[PDB]
Design a protein around this ligand. Structure first.
Ligand SMILES: Nc1ncnc2c1ccn2[C@@H]1O[C@H](CO)[C@@H](O)[C@H]1O
Ligand SMILES: [Cl-]
Ligand SMILES: [Cl-]
Ligand SMILES: [Zn+2]
Ligand SMILES: [Zn+2]
Lengths: 301, 116
């Protein structure tokens, strides 16, 4: 197989190049479950595999790295994904997380509220999102591009992702957005990554690798999602937890990637080539300041 | 003059046969680490499990103030190593036990400072 010993499976380039029409997602392995190591939560396993895959890409890893994690709370009031990210990321990495619902976290700072209330002064080197609304999995109605938090994420990327930075945004059959796929063409490389532990689900992480701030490629996101579902529908993925047992090479290498401030005029093809190779981050190196907008109401009389 | 004593309430709840706090976040790791008690990354050895710190802190989990006068947390943002034999109750373990200020191991579960 080979694939069962990987952390997961990335969408093969040839499927990206198709022009499929959107169909219903019918997974052969739906209902299968991987055998998780004793006492290990799905969320921990899933993030572990995501990070293992991200270790194979050309992520920029500067000193004083800035990472933000949306959708980080669980129904049990803790943040398993944040815990894996902080393990993975170099010690000292600035990690901020957020959720609609209250939770306790190991992040350096946590904001509770709708993601649309979240503002930051600074730019980020890596954006992770597990935001998901299970009310989108309505199989009886048409599956159109969704707005909501995806609209926030697309703006947040274009406004606050450092050039050279990367993203991983959770999608499913029904939880997806066409502009987010289009924005994948603004990175040097992109894919949809399915974890082997959760391969029975139409979930994937849409990964943009090394942001360029402009389209490198024009992607129709309606077509690309249909391509993604076509791939899933015709390529059963064997549930596997095998990669969870070898953590020896898990930590993200602190590459000390260079950070420069630059104005949109000085970004030439040589800068762009460095961005594209994971060798450069462009943003301010100022203090990290965040906030959550709070709506004020007085309900009396 | 009045303060809630959540530490005591949990100790007494446990003694009365209550189910330990659950959903502590256990990490995947090599289990070839230093075995120190509270670390910046998982350091479980072969006899330990490593957990996300916040999820094993009574005060974090109960949404109450930390006994530190500054409210600071020893666990949040770090990883806590729990003997496998006590991993059914990490919160109880961290609350009842103490870290050697010299070697960083749990007194009684790794610390060999008082004669090896
Ligand atoms: N618009 C939003 N802003 C912030 N967090 C959001 C949403 C929508 C969903 N979520 C959070 O995503 C997690 C995964 O379902 C859940 O923890 C859920 O709370
Ligand atoms: Cl449809
Ligand atoms: Cl396309
Ligand atoms: Zn705490
Ligand atoms: Zn000692």
């Amino acid at each position: 197989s080979s694939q069962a010993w990987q952390p997961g499976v990335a969408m093969p380039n040839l499927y990206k190049m198709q022009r499929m029409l959107l169909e219903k997602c019918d997974l052969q392995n739906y209902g299968d479950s991987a055998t998780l190591p004793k006492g290990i939560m799905m969320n921990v396993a899933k993030y572990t595999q995501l990070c293992q895959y991200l270790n194979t890409l050309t992520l920029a890893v500067p000193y004083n790295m800035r990472v933000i994690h949306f959708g980080a709370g669980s129904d049990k009031g803790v943040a398993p994904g944040t815990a894996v990210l902080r393990q993975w990321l170099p010690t000292g990495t600035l990690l901020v997380d957020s959720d609609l619902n209250d939770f306790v976290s190991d992040a350096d700072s946590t904001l509770i509220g709708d993601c649309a209330t979240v503002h930051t002064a600074n730019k980020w080197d890596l954006i992770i999102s597990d935001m998901y609304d299970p009310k989108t999995k309505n199989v009886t109605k048409e599956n159109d591009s969704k707005e909501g938090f995806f609209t926030y994420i697309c703006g947040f990327i274009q406004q606050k992702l450092a050039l050279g930075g990367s993203v991983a945004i959770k999608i499913t059959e029904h939880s997806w957005n066409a502009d987010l796929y289009k924005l994948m063409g603004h990175f040097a490389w992109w894919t949809a990554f399915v974890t082997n532990v959760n391969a029975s689900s139409s979930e994937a992480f849409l990964i943009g690798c090394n942001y360029l701030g402009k389209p490198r490629e024009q992607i129709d996101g309606y077509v690309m999602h249909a391509n993604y579902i076509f791939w899933r529908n015709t390529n059963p993925i064997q549930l596997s937890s095998y990669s969870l047992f070898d953590m020896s090479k898990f930590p993200l290498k602190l590459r000390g990637t260079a950070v420069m401030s630059l104005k949109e005029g000085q970004i030439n093809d040589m800068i762009l080539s460095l961005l594209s190779k994971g060798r450069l981050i462009i943003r301010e190196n100022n203090r990290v300041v965040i906030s959550s907008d709070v709506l004020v109401n007085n309900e009396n009389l | 003059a009045f303060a809630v004593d959540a530490a005591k309430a949990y100790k007494d709840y446990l003694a009365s046969g209550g189910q330990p706090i659950t959903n502590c976040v256990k990490m995947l790791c090599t289990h070839t680490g230093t075995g120190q008690a509270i670390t910046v990354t998982p350091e479980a050895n072969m006899d330990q499990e490593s957990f996300g710190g916040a999820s094993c802190c009574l005060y974090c989990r109960c949404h109450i103030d930390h006994p530190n006068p500054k409210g600071f947390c020893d666990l949040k943002g770090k990883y806590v190593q729990i003997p496998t034999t006590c991993a059914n109750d990490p919160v109880g373990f961290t609350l009842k036990n103490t870290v050697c200020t010299v070697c960083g191991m749990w007194k009684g579960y790794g610390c060999s400072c008082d004669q090896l």
